Amino acid sequence: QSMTPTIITDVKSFAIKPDRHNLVVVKVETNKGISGLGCSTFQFRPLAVKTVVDEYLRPLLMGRDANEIEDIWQVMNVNSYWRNGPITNNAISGIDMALWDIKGQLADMPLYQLLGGKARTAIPAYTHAVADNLDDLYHEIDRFLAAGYRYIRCQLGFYGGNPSQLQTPEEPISGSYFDQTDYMETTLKMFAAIKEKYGNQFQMLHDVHERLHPNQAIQFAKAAEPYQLFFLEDILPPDQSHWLTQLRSQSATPIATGELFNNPMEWQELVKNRQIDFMRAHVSQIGGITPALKLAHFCDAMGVRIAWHTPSDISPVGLAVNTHLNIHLHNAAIQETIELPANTQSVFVGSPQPKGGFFYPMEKSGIGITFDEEAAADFPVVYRPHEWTQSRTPDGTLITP
Amino acid sequence: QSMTPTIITDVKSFAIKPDRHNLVVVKVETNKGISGLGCSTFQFRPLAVKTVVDEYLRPLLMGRDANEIEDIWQVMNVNSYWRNGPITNNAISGIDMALWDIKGQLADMPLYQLLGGKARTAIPAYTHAVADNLDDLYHEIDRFLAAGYRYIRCQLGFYGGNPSQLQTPEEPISGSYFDQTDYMETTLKMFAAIKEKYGNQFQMLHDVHERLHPNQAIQFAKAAEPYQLFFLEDILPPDQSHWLTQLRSQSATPIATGELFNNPMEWQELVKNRQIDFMRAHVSQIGGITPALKLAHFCDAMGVRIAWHTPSDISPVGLAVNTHLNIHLHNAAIQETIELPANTQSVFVGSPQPKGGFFYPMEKSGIGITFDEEAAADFPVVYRPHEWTQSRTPDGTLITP
Amino acid sequence: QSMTPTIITDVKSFAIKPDRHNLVVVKVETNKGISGLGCSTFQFRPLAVKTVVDEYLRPLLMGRDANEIEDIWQVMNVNSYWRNGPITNNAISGIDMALWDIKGQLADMPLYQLLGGKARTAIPAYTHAVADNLDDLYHEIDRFLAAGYRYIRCQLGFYGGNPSQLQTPEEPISGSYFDQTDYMETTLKMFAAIKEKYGNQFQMLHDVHERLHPNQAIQFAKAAEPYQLFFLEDILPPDQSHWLTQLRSQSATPIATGELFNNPMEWQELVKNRQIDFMRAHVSQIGGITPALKLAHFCDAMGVRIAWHTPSDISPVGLAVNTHLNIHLHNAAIQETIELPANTQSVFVGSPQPKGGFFYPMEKSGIGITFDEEAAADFPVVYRPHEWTQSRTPDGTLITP
Amino acid sequence: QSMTPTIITDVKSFAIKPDRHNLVVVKVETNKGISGLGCSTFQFRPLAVKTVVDEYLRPLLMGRDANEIEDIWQVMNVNSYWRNGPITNNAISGIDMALWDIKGQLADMPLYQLLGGKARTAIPAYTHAVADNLDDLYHEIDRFLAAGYRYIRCQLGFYGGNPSQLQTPEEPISGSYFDQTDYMETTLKMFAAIKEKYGNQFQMLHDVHERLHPNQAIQFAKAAEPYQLFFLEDILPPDQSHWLTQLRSQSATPIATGELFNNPMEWQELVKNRQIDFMRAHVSQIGGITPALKLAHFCDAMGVRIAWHTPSDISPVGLAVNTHLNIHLHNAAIQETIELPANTQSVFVGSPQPKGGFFYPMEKSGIGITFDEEAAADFPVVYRPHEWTQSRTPDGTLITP
Ligand SMILES: [Cl-]
Ligand SMILES: [Cl-]
Ligand SMILES: [Cl-]
Ligand SMILES: [Cl-]
Ligand SMILES: [Cl-]
Ligand SMILES: [Cl-]
Ligand SMILES: [Mg+2]
Ligand SMILES: [Mg+2]
Ligand SMILES: [Mg+2]
Ligand SMILES: [Mg+2]
């Protein structure tokens, strides 16, 4: 034959914290001595993801033929009967990505080539500029412009912190407090100042990060329209996305959403009805490369573009996968980038980095990342309280974070 | 590197007629000595497809890097500005399939493995039973049942021929004549007779082949409901598919359509609105494997299944491609089959054949078909008049064929 | 009788290039010595159109009664089973137009009279002003205004060329490059400058030529609204025209589209739902005069107007046909015009030319064009690479051209 | 030139009653000695139609160029500012038809040839079988079957007459009385009896003639479904046609309507939304051939077929026009026929008659009818009370007739 079964002989998970974020990576070993890596990084619940991989997915997968990625994905997806969700899908993602890594290595092709080759020369990147005053923000923007970036996510002010820092009722419920009206006003002030100073030199992005009640979100998105953002992101929480119908009939601000999605019913109608311009799914949250390709193709049919969520809390394996998908998929639009720290580079070898404001194709076979098991051992998970997920308006209402 | 450019060094087309149908196949040669085959078979206009490949696609493609299938597809698709259509897309398909063949060979994987592996053990097949009387029809059905088929397309009577054979006005316009009411009545008689004789032993399919005016189609599809067909196919022509809205609200007969499609606007709303159950696209009519994968994924998002059109007028290259797609795609449902004649097997080596009513995965790297250039030379194109495409009702109205 | 059969005794095609564009014209001869001409001009695939006419339509048509234009159209339209598309329809168009030419000659009436007579005195014309700077653009506009034009298509800048001319990634994929944001900004700058200088002296048109992603198209069309264009054309590619729903609910910019259409499913919903103001079909792309009349009447029912695509790459036969249709149809709005060069006038006699900014009725019987077979012989087809159909944004993405 | 102006030198109208129905015909004379005839027959208000032609259309039209049918139609249509309606449109129709007659004569072509030639060999005809008992109905059906008819409109019982003939309140308001429940029950009894006796030998039609309240109409149409009528006609009055939405979602009975229409807003949504299968417009009620062609093309786009209203109260000029339209239009379905009496044949020469259940193309140039002015003089209009238009249910409610 030209191809024999590739038998899974081990499944391992590694929950580690080299730098600021808890990561989870999965390694699948085979009888051929070809191993694959995958990203299962859900930084807030890494121990729970590890439990799923070690106690449930490993015994399910042992002995199976890794060549059949599609069937294995389908099996994993429904294996616990109840399905979808952030812990469930991250565990599945690590396996699915590792199987694609293995297939690329067997083919001796980088992942983007195995998938059908490139759709572009390189994918544009965007960086993040955030400061509590305009002067410091301009300095960040200036640096990125000199580095070749033509797309920059911009935020003025910080929106969290002790209730002592703003007007609240007495004895406020503990949490991370901000004022929605101050957030909107300050951000519009920022848009106007950046536009006046930089004009067409680059395109702003901005992430509303579900800070607003529905009508506030609609008003804010309308107000963003004159500033010609590349996109305005997450103006509504996932379960109130239908409110976009009112916005879309009166505004042409470009809309991105989806980093929070982990269930197809969150996006099915949005995509079918062209209610968003950019799908921002986090690949591991939707269950890996297998479902990501299908989603990208569904979006493409509707003219919806892709901008996978690629935050600081992603492993270099997940970063590499997004790079391959972005080079291959015709409807990929942009690649979110945050600089990788030194400890992380010590554990993961081969991570892509932007060059002159673009990410170029990665050429090693498979995903292209090597994992140093021994170095990883020095960086166990460390518990974080992440108080920003207890976000409150001044009256003490717990809002979507 | 793990992978160097694969430079296209020739593009050849072969219009041939080994048996009953004019075929067109394309061969792409590379600097690596790896060649790929593709199907461009549009049996009614083979010389026009050959003109497009030889005069336009060859000079466009010479020297390009065959690894970049996605980019090359995008380039070909819009290259003549005006696009879509049966001649345009068949020419593109032959190239696209050949590039996938090359990529599979470079990977040393059969196409279904390169795409992500299998989603099933084997795809069910269906055959065709057609006769002008019930007794002969039963004999065909009996033979197929003994052979292991559980799905059989059934047709009673022939619907064409000289106007002398039915009541028409005097001096009828020349054409292939039939009576729509006789067709409907005879077919319902067939459904009832088969159901009484065979019950649940197999599932019938039936192809209406756009024979009907819209209300007739709706009535006929409703009348088919008690007979539990696997699907009822092409009840409406492509430009009147919106009439399905009336049918779908009052009937649950399973509906298949799409073999005629060669423009995404033919299916976009049908799929988005779940107005069909099975998409029956002819892969070469939609431009090859690249767009077929995207369409299958779009359909999958909506719960629509795939049953690629696989008639007698398809080359063994196109047949092999459908087999790989059917093994790989989770939403593939069934594979239409017609027996391959001896002359064809003389020119094409490696064609898949059903075994016990299923098609199994093909294991040679790439698509898996070898083409005998020398044998092909003995079978030039031969002009056919195909009078059945001049179909008329008794009054002489030219209807969709 | 008052009328005997008109038997088709030959069908000839001529693929020629007198000037800048490959043309295809068809000639139908009859037993009455009355011949007709038709336009089958698809400049990018002229040899393929010729193959269809010579190898397939000629034998189908020989001996038929040319009087029955409607039946012959219906026969041709479905003759290859699969149908629609640019090559298929252009071949059909040449025959259909020639039959109308013959019928007009037998009637001794110009085509517009045969169809029912005029609906206006003369159809307004529009010309094209394009330059890479405002000063040169104003000089073009000034000249057209003095010539009597009240409608002028305006474009500032050129949007194509070597990737060396803009910022791209290294080793850019070959193609014709432009920047969408620069295109939008420069065009809005043009609208504002022309409005300030000329005010109400004439109405601008502008052709977006499917350069934009969907949300960009919507934003750009909204931004065009204050400039009171006669129409804004092709803001979206044909398979993403549904995105107009979002635009139409928030903007009253006049929208034209359809030059790319060659399948009724591209326009059926757009027209039914009044989502466009002007239908810009290219008559030969939709299969000739027979389907053009039906489409114009369907549009008229919905209040949609007609502006047939009449570019430089049309034969004088196609130009004459559009002139007759524009004089006759109540909902015809405007006639796109580009000057005809000398070599072309050497081969075709009788071409209409605008006078004082209008086209007047043509008075010779039939279509009114004579074709010089001998002169045509001096101008064979010459292959063109047309790199503009390989249009890319800076990242290298192949976009709709 | 090939064609000079054709100047209108007189317009005459003739209101006559050769047999059972008041007819109105119009004659347009020209400077060329070519005259045309048109039908303005609105049998209930013939003197009012004559007033419009003689007092208003004649002075408007005198001296105009008859060649410009399209412009003249547009002028007539809006000439009284307020427009549409049965008297307005019938007057316009007579002129429009006469101008087409003139154009056909100038072309030396029968009207169907001038329009583009035939779409079929001959149009099927249907006759009417009506009796107050089944036996007499069967005798009518038997006779028509022997004559070659395959389509027969069937009615059992008569639904009108003195209130003495059914149960009513005392001192009933004068009118023509019937019982809706008796009508529905008797008609379903008829459907069942005919089906049992004749089966597939012919297809029934039935005209509900707006006898029913909306829910009754929906129930009745559903109940007709098993009987496979060619169509069920006028189940609802024109201003309650929207009630079809409920019927269409649960029934596939074929629906025809439109003989009452004289305003495009009556049909615009019905056709656009495919809520009817057959459009039954009375050509003179919609303003003549010019708007009839447009309506037929609009219907064709939507897959709606045409069956022009051709009752006994139509002039032979109107009958001839319908015959030409039915031979030419691809979506024409059937031609209603009632036998022409002897006095009428004395005044009009050239009337078409069905042969073996079909109407064949008419071959004289123009419409093909000659009018005997002298014979017409013997048949002045005679006032009729037409009590059937005062239709009442037993309680005395005046219902749509
Ligand atoms: Cl932000
Ligand atoms: Cl084509
Ligand atoms: Cl069948
Ligand atoms: Cl322009
Ligand atoms: Cl009136
Ligand atoms: Cl009746
Ligand atoms: Mg975000
Ligand atoms: Mg079929
Ligand atoms: Mg254009
Ligand atoms: Mg009626």
Short mmCIF file of N, CA and C and ligand atoms in Angstrom, two decimals, chain B residues 128-130 153-156 183 190 205-208 211 233, ligand 3:
data_model
loop_
_atom_site.label_atom_id
_atom_site.label_comp_id
_atom_site.label_asym_id
_atom_site.label_seq_id
_atom_site.Cartn_x
_atom_site.Cartn_y
_atom_site.Cartn_z
N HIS B 128 -29.46 1.67 -11.33
CA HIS B 128 -30.65 2.12 -12.06
C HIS B 128 -31.39 0.96 -12.70
N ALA B 129 -32.69 0.88 -12.40
CA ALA B 129 -33.59 -0.09 -13.00
C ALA B 129 -34.62 0.66 -13.84
N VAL B 130 -34.61 0.41 -15.15
CA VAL B 130 -35.52 1.08 -16.08
C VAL B 130 -36.02 0.08 -17.09
N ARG B 153 -32.60 3.26 -8.17
CA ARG B 153 -33.38 4.24 -8.91
C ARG B 153 -34.27 3.51 -9.89
N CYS B 154 -35.57 3.78 -9.84
CA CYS B 154 -36.56 3.04 -10.62
C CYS B 154 -37.33 3.94 -11.57
N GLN B 155 -37.46 3.50 -12.81
CA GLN B 155 -38.26 4.22 -13.79
C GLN B 155 -39.03 3.23 -14.65
N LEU B 156 -40.33 3.49 -14.78
CA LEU B 156 -41.22 2.69 -15.61
C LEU B 156 -41.66 3.51 -16.80
N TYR B 183 -46.67 10.44 -17.78
CA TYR B 183 -45.46 10.23 -16.99
C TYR B 183 -45.78 10.16 -15.49
N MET B 190 -46.05 2.74 -10.73
CA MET B 190 -44.81 2.02 -10.43
C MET B 190 -44.49 2.02 -8.94
N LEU B 205 -35.27 5.26 -5.47
CA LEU B 205 -35.04 6.64 -5.86
C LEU B 205 -35.79 6.89 -7.17
N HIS B 206 -36.10 8.14 -7.48
CA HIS B 206 -36.69 8.43 -8.79
C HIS B 206 -36.24 9.81 -9.21
N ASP B 207 -35.94 9.96 -10.49
CA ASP B 207 -35.46 11.21 -11.08
C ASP B 207 -36.52 11.81 -12.01
N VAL B 208 -37.14 12.91 -11.56
CA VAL B 208 -38.15 13.62 -12.34
C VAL B 208 -37.52 14.35 -13.53
N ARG B 211 -39.07 17.36 -15.81
CA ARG B 211 -40.10 17.09 -16.83
C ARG B 211 -41.38 17.90 -16.65
N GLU B 233 -35.69 13.34 -7.16
CA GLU B 233 -34.65 14.19 -7.70
C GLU B 233 -35.14 15.13 -8.84
CL CL E 3 -35.75 7.50 -12.37
#
